[PDB]
JSON list of C-alpha atoms in Angstrom, two decimals:
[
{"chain": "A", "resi": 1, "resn": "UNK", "atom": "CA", "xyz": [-9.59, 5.34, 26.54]},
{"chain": "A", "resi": 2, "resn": "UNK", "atom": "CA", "xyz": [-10.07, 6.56, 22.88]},
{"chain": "A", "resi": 3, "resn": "UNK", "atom": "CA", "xyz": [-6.85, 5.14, 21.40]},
{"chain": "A", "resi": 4, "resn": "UNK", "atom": "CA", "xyz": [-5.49, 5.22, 17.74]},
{"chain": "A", "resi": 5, "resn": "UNK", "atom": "CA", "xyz": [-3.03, 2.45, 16.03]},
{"chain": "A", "resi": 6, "resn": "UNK", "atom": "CA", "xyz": [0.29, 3.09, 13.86]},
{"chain": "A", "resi": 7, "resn": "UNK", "atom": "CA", "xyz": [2.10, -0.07, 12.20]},
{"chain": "A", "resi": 8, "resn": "UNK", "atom": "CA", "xyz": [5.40, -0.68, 12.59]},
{"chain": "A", "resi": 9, "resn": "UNK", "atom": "CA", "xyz": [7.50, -3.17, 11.29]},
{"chain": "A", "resi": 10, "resn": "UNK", "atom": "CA", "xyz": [10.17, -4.52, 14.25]},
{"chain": "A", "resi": 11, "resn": "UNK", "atom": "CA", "xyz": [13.66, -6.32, 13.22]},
{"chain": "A", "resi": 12, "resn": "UNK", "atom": "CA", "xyz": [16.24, -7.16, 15.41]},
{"chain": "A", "resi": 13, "resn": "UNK", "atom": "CA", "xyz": [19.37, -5.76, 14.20]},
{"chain": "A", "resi": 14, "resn": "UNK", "atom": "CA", "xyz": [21.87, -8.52, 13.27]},
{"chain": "A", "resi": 15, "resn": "UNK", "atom": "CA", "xyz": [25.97, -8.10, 13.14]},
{"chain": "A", "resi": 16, "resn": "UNK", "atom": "CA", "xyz": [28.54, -7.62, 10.42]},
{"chain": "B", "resi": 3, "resn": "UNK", "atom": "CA", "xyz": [31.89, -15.42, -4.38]},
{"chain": "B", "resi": 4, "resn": "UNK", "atom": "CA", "xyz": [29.19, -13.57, -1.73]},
{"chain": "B", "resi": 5, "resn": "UNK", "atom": "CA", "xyz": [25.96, -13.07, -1.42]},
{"chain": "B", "resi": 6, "resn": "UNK", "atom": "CA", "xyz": [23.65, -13.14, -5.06]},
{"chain": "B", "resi": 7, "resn": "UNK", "atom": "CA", "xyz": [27.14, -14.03, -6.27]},
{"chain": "B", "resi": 8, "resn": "UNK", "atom": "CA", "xyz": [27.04, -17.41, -5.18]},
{"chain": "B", "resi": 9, "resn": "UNK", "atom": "CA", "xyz": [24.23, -18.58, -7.92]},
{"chain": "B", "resi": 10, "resn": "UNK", "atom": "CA", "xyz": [21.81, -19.43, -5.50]},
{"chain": "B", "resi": 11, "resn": "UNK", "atom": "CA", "xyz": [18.43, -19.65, -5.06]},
{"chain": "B", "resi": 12, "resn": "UNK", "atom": "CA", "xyz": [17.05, -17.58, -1.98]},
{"chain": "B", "resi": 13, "resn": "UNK", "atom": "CA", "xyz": [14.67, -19.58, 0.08]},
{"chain": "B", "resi": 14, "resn": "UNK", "atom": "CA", "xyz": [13.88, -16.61, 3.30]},
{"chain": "B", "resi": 15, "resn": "UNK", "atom": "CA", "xyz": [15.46, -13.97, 5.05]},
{"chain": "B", "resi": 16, "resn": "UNK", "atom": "CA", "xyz": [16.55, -14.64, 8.55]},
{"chain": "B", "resi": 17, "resn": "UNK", "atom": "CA", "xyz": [17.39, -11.08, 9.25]},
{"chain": "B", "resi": 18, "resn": "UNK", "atom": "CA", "xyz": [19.02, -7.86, 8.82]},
{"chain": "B", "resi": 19, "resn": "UNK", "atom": "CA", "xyz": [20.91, -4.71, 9.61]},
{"chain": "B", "resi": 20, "resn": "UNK", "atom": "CA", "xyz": [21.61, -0.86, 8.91]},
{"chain": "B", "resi": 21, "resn": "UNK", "atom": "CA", "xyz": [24.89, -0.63, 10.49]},
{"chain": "B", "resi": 22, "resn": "UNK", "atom": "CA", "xyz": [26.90, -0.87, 7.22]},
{"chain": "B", "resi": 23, "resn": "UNK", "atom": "CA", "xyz": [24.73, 2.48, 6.83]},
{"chain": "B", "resi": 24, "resn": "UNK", "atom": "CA", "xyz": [22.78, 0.73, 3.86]},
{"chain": "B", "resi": 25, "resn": "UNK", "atom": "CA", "xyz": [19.96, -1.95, 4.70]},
{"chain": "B", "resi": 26, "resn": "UNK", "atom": "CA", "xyz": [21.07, -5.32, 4.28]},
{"chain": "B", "resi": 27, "resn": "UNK", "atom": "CA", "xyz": [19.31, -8.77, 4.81]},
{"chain": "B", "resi": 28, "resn": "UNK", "atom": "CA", "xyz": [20.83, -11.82, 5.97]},
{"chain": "B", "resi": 29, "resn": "UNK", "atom": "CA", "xyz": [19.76, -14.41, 3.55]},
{"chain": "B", "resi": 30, "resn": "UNK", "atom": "CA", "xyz": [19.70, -18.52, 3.61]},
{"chain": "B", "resi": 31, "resn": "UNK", "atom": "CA", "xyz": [19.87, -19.65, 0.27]},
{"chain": "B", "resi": 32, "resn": "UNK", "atom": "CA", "xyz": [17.82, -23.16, -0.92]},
{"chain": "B", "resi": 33, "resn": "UNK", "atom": "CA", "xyz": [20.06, -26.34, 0.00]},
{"chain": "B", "resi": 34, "resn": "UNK", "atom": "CA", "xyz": [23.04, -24.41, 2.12]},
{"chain": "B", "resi": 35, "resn": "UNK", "atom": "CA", "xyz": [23.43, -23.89, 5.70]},
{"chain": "B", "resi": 36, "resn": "UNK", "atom": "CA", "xyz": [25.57, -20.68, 5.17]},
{"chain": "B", "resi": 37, "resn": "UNK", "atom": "CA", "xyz": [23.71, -17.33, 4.76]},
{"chain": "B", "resi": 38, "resn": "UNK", "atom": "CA", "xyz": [25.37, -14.03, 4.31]},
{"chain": "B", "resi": 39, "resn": "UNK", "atom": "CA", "xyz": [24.47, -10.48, 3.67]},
{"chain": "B", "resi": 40, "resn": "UNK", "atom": "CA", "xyz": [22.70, -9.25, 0.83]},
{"chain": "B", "resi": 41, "resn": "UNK", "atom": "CA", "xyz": [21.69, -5.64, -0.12]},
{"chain": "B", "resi": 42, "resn": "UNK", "atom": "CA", "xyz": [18.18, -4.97, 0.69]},
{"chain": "B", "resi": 43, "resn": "UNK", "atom": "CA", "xyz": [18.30, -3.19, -2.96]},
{"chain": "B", "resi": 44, "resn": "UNK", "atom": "CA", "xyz": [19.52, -6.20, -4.66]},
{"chain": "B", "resi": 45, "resn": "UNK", "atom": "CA", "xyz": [16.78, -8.15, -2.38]},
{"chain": "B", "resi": 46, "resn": "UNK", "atom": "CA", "xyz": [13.84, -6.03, -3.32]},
{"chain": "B", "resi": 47, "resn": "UNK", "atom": "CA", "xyz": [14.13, -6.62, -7.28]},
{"chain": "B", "resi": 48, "resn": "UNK", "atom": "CA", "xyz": [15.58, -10.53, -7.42]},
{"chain": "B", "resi": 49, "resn": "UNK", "atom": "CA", "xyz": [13.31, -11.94, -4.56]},
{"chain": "B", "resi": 50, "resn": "UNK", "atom": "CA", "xyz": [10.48, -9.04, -3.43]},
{"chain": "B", "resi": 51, "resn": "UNK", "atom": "CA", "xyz": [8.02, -11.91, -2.70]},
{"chain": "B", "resi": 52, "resn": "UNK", "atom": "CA", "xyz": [10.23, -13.25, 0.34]},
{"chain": "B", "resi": 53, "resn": "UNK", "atom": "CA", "xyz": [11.58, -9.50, 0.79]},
{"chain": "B", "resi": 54, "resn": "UNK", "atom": "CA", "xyz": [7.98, -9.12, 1.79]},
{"chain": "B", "resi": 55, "resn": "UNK", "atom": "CA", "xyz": [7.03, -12.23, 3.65]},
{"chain": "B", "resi": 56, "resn": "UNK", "atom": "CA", "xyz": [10.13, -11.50, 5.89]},
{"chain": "B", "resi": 57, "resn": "UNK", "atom": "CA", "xyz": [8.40, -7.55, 7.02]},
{"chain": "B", "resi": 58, "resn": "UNK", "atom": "CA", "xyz": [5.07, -9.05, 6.85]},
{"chain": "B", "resi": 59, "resn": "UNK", "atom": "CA", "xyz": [6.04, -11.18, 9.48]},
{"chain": "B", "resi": 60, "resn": "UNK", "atom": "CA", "xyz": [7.27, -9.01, 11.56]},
{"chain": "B", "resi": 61, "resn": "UNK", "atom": "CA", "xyz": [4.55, -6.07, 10.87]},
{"chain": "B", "resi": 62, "resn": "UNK", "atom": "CA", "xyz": [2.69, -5.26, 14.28]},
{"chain": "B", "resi": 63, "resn": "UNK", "atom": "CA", "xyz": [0.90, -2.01, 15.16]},
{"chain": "B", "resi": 64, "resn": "UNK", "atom": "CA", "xyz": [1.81, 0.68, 18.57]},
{"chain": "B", "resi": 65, "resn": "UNK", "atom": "CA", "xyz": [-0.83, 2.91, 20.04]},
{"chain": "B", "resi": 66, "resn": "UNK", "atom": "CA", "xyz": [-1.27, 6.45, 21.08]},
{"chain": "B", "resi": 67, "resn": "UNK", "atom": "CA", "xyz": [-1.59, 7.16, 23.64]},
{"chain": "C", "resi": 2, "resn": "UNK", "atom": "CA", "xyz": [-19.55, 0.84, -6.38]},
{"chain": "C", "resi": 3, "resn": "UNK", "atom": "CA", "xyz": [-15.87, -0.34, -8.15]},
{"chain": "C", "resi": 4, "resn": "UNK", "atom": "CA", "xyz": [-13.11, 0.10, -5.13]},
{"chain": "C", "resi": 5, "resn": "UNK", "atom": "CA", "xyz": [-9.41, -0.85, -4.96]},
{"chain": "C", "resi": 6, "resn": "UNK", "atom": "CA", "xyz": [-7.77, -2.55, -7.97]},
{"chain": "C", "resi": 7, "resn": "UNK", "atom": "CA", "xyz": [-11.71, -2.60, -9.44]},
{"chain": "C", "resi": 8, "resn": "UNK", "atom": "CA", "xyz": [-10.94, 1.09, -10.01]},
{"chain": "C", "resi": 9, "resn": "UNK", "atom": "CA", "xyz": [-8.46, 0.22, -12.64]},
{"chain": "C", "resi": 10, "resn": "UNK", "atom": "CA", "xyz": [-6.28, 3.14, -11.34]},
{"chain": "C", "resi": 11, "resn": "UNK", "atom": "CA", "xyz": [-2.22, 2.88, -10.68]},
{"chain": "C", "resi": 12, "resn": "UNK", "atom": "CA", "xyz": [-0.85, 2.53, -7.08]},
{"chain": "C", "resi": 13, "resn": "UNK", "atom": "CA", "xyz": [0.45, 5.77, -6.30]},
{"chain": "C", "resi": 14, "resn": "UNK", "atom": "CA", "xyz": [1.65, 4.69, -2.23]},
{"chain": "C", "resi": 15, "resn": "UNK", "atom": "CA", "xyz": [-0.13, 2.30, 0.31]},
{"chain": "C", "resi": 16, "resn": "UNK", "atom": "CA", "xyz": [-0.38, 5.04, 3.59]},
{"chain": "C", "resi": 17, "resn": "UNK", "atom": "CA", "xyz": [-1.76, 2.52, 6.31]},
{"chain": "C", "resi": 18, "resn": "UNK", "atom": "CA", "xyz": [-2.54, -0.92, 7.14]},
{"chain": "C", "resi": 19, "resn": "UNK", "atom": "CA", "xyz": [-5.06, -3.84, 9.31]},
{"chain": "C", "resi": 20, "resn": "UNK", "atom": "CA", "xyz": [-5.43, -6.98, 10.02]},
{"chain": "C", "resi": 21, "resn": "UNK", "atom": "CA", "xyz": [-8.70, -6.29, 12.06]},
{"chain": "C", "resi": 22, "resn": "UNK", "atom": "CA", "xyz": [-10.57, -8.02, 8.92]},
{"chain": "C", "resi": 23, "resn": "UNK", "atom": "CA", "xyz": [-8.80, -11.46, 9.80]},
{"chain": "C", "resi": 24, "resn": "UNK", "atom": "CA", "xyz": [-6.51, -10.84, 6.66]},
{"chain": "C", "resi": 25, "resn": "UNK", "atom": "CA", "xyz": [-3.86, -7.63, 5.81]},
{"chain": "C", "resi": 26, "resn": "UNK", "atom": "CA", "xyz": [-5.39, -5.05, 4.45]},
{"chain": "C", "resi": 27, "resn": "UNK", "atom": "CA", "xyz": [-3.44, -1.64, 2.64]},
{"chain": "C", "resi": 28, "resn": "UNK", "atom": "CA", "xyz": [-4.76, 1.30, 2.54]},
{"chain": "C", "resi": 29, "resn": "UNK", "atom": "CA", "xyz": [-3.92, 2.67, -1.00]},
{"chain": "C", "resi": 30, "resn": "UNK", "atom": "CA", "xyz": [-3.86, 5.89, -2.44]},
{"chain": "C", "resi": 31, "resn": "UNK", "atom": "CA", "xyz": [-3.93, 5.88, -6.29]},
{"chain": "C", "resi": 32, "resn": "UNK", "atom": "CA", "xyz": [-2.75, 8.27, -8.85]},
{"chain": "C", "resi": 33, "resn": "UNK", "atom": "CA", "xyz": [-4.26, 10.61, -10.56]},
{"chain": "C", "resi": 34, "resn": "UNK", "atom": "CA", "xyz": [-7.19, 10.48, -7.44]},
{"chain": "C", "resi": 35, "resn": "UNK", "atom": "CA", "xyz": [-7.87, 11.89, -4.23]},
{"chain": "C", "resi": 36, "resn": "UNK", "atom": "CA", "xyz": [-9.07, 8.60, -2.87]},
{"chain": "C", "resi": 37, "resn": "UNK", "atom": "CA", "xyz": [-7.95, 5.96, -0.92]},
{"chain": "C", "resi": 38, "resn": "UNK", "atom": "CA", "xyz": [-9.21, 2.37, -0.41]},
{"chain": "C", "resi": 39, "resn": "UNK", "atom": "CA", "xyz": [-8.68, -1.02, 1.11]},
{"chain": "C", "resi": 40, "resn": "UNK", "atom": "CA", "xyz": [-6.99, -3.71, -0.59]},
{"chain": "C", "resi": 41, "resn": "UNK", "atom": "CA", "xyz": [-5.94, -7.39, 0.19]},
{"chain": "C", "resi": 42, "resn": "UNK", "atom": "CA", "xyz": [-2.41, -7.55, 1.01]},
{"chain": "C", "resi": 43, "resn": "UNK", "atom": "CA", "xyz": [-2.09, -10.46, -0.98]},
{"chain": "C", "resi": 44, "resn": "UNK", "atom": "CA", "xyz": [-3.14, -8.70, -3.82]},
{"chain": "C", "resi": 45, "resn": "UNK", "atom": "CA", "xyz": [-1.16, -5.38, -3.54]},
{"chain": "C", "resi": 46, "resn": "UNK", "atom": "CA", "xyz": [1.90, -7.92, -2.86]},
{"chain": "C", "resi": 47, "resn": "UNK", "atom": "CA", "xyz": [2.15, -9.08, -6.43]},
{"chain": "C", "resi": 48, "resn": "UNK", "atom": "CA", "xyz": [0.55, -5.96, -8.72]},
{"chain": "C", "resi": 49, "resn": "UNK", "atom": "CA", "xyz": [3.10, -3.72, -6.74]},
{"chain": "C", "resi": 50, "resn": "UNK", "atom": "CA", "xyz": [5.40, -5.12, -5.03]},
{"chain": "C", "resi": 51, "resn": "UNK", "atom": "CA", "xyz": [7.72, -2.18, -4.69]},
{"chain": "C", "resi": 52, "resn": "UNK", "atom": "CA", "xyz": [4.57, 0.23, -3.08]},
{"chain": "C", "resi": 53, "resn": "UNK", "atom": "CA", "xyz": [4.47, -2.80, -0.81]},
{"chain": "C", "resi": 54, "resn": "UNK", "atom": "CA", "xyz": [8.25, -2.98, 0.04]},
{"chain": "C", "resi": 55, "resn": "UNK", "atom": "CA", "xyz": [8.48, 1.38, -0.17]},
{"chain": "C", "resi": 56, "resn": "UNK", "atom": "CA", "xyz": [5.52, 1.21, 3.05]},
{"chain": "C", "resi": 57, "resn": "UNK", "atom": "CA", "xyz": [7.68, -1.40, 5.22]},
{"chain": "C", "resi": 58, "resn": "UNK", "atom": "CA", "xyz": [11.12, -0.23, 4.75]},
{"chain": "C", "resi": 59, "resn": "UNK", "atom": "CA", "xyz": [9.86, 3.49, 5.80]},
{"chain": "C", "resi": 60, "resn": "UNK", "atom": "CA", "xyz": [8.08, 2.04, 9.07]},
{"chain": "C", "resi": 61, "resn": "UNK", "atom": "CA", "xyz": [11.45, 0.01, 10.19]},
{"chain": "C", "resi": 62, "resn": "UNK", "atom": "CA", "xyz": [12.22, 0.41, 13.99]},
{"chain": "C", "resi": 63, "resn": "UNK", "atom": "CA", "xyz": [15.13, -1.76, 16.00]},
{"chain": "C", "resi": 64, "resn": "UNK", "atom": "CA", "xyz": [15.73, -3.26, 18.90]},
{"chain": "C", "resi": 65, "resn": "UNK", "atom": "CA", "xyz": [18.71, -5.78, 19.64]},
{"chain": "C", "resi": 66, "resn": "UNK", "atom": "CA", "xyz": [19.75, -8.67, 22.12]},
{"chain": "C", "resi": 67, "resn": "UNK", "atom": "CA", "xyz": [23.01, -10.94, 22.07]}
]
């Protein structure tokens, strides 16, 4: 499978 | 006092949010064991280096397909 | 031969990323240039640190738990 990579940056969103 | 307000020295980000509708970071501040929210303006300009260890961290790459 | 910072050029935006190297690499454009290169992350972190910050905060995506 020819495949192709995009970053991403993940954050957990917090409260308040 | 809040936030940059308090005099403090940042020591790492332990998180953040969007839902004020502006990005803000949730900041621990050298020798305290109470964080609060900062602006992730005021963040970028008085700390960037540990603005950008906290996405660097968290950086990681999806595929398609 | 002179690539990245070597070029002596002015970080116009950083447009992709890898660590497949074993360290972070950017991949920079530059202005007043049509080209593009790797460079160290840990160099791009400190001679622009606001390209850097500008390429995160665009690729942010959420997810939540209690």
């Amino acid at each position: 499978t020819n495949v192709s990579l995009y970053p991403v940056v993940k954050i957990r969103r917090l409260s308040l | 006092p809040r936030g940059f307000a308090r005099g403090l020295e940042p020591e790492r980000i332990i998180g953040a949010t969007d839902s004020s509708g502006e990005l803000m970071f949730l900041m621990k501040w050298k020798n305290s064991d109470e964080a609060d929210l900062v602006p992730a303006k005021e963040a970028n300009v008085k700390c960037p280096q540990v603005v950008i260890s906290f996405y660097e961290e968290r950086l990681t790459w999806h595929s398609y397909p």
